[PDB]
Design a protein around this motif. Structure first.
Motif, mmCIF file in Angstrom:
data_model
loop_
_atom_site.group_PDB
_atom_site.id
_atom_site.type_symbol
_atom_site.label_atom_id
_atom_site.label_comp_id
_atom_site.label_asym_id
_atom_site.label_seq_id
_atom_site.Cartn_x
_atom_site.Cartn_y
_atom_site.Cartn_z
ATOM 1 N N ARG A 63 0.779 -1.332 0.208
ATOM 2 C CA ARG A 63 0.047 0.022 -0.089
ATOM 3 C C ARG A 63 0.920 1.234 0.031
ATOM 4 O O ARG A 63 2.081 1.231 0.803
ATOM 5 N N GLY A 64 0.556 2.197 -0.578
ATOM 6 C CA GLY A 64 1.221 3.473 -0.595
ATOM 7 C C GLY A 64 0.536 4.679 -1.310
ATOM 8 O O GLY A 64 -0.759 4.335 -1.726
ATOM 9 N N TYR A 80 3.100 2.704 2.628
ATOM 10 C CA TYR A 80 2.373 2.733 4.111
ATOM 11 C C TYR A 80 2.485 1.362 4.593
ATOM 12 O O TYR A 80 2.904 0.318 3.967
ATOM 13 N N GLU A 81 2.085 1.303 5.752
ATOM 14 C CA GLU A 81 1.949 0.009 6.413
ATOM 15 C C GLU A 81 0.485 -0.597 6.100
ATOM 16 O O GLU A 81 -0.363 0.147 5.434
ATOM 17 N N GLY A 84 -2.411 1.386 6.871
ATOM 18 C CA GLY A 84 -2.568 2.596 6.608
ATOM 19 C C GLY A 84 -1.808 3.728 6.907
ATOM 20 O O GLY A 84 -1.956 4.930 6.305
ATOM 21 N N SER A 85 -1.213 3.381 8.093
ATOM 22 C CA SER A 85 -0.191 4.596 8.576
ATOM 23 C C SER A 85 1.259 4.504 7.645
ATOM 24 O O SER A 85 1.448 3.615 6.810
ATOM 25 N N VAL A 86 1.614 5.764 7.653
ATOM 26 C CA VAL A 86 2.993 5.831 6.799
ATOM 27 C C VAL A 86 3.907 4.803 7.411
ATOM 28 O O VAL A 86 4.181 4.756 8.710
ATOM 29 N N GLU A 151 -3.846 7.323 -3.493
ATOM 30 C CA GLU A 151 -3.579 5.790 -2.772
ATOM 31 C C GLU A 151 -3.659 4.611 -3.707
ATOM 32 O O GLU A 151 -4.441 4.529 -4.680
#
Lengths: 297, 297
Positions: A63-64, A80-81, A84-86, A151
């Motif tokens: 995800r990024g 991202y993780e 959804g956090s960076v 995203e």
């Protein structure tokens, strides 16, 4: 609750290093170097190690957010993780959870965003596989979008893989030969000298198979065992869980083995590469010390 | 053993109809026709229905043998079941276990054999998606091999999907315009009229999204619950398991629901499509009869 393993046959379980059904079960005592896999790592008490994802299905997913609009078949993502956090490079992690933990020439992928014209295929070339830096450059990307700031979520589907031994060679996560600052799960080394790591194998799809076509990636624990440890509150009452591998249809006891509390299995008495039947089930017997000597296979 | 569900949050679990992490949890009371999904179907006593694979990782995987050498980007495969046994198309099964159970314009795939020059990508066009006949014609196949009689194994990776509603439309598995000879698991229908199916949703990668870019495929049970039912010896002491969906961090109870013995969850009092937080855990409360009326959401 008393320790147990799920009542699944080996061929009813899944690899924890490549999403696919387990196809082989083998011990190879002549591998050049000990593996230092970062996925498929979990203690018996349910502590995940390395980049092992807590969600089974985030293995080989990413995800990024696009850092610029696609141009010249290039898509660069800030990573991202899964939550959804960076992804924070300063944390010491080599990559977001679930990222491939081995060396390949290419990592082939598909990805999409929540808006039109963002579904595409592409790849991460080895020289660009530096996720510890916080992003990845995707090349041969074949969609017209995304624009910047969008995203993207995707899946690594296959690899360019000229040499099967590279499955046991960690990638240069930070773009250098120096991994000292990275928080890496430790190498997997049997505690007794006559013991050999028991490998749970599956077949990934790869290109670059002109030299030799057989591709096998191994893991220390079936994914279903890792989830089992996460969903039970086990206490490791000894250094290792003594297990029996039994063919439940035919009754034949095939071998006994040790599941060390740090999360891997060994057998004894293997002098050459040895494959085992896939229709057996592993059953807990008792807790034993590190120097408990197994009956040879 | 007393009934339980694993302690995983919804976002820590996986879809049983498309291999990917669960991303949404919602009840839609305005779906006109009940779903008749063939994957993701399992009773609480651990009996699989439909094409639901016993091995979680055989979902969207296939294996077979080439019937002819590749020519004009066409690869025809005679299908096997996951265990390598031959899939008998005269038996009434709609497809080998794990095959997609919905309508799409294209099913995109990758596959490979044991020999070089057999790694390729291709697709099954809707008109060719007739696996009940015992084989599939793969088109747009981009590898030079295999020759005839060669085993191949592959993965369904994405779909061409013009309409999200087609995820709930069974495909014409035998190409006969749905003649009713196939052995299909029954439709999923709440047993009380005020109840609404609770859908566990994930996002598959799809093309043909230019007009409506949101794609969501739902399933009745997370894969991890299916495996839980297969690895426990549960006895349903009632028609349905009353569950509470709780945020364990905050302690907030979000709703109660019924998990029917045939393997799906319902909520009560839903009048518009309603989404729910993903960080909750479903906790078993007690067994209830079919007529038990839930507190409205």
């Amino acid at each position: 609750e008393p320790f147990s393993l799920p009542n699944l046959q080996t061929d009813e379980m899944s690899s924890s290093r490549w999403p696919n059904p387990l196809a082989t079960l083998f011990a190879d005592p002549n591998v050049a170097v000990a593996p230092q896999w970062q996925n498929g790592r979990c203690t018996l008490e349910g502590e995940l190690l390395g980049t092992t994802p807590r969600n089974a299905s985030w293995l080989n997913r990413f995800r990024g957010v696009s850092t610029a609009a696609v141009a010249n078949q290039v898509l660069h993502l800030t990573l991202y993780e899964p939550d959804g956090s960076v992804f924070n490079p300063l944390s010491g992690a080599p990559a977001p959870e679930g990222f491939p933990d081995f060396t390949a020439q290419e990592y082939h992928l598909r990805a999409a965003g929540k808006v039109a014209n963002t579904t595409g295929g592409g790849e991460i070339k080895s020289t660009d596989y530096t996720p510890a830096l916080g992003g990845v450059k995707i090349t041969a990307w074949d969609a017209t979008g995304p624009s910047a700031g969008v995203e993207m979520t995707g899946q690594i589907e296959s690899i360019g893989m000229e040499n099967n031994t590279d499955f046991d060679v960690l990638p240069d996560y930070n773009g250098s030969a120096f991994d000292g600052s990275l928080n890496l799960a430790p190498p997997i080394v049997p505690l007794l000298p006559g013991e050999t790591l028991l490998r749970f194998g599956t077949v990934p799809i790869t290109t670059r198979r002109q030299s030799d076509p057989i591709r096998i990636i191994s893991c220390a624990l079936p994914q279903e065992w890792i989830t089992w440890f996460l969903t039970h509150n086990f206490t490791a009452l000894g250094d290792a869980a003594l297990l029996r591998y039994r063919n439940q249809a035919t009754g034949q006891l095939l071998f006994e083995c040790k599941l060390y509390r740090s999360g891997f299995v060994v057998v004894n008495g293997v002098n050459v590469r040895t494959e085992f039947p896939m229709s057996g089930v592993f059953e807990f017997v008792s807790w034993v010390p590190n120097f408990f000597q197994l009956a040879p296979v």
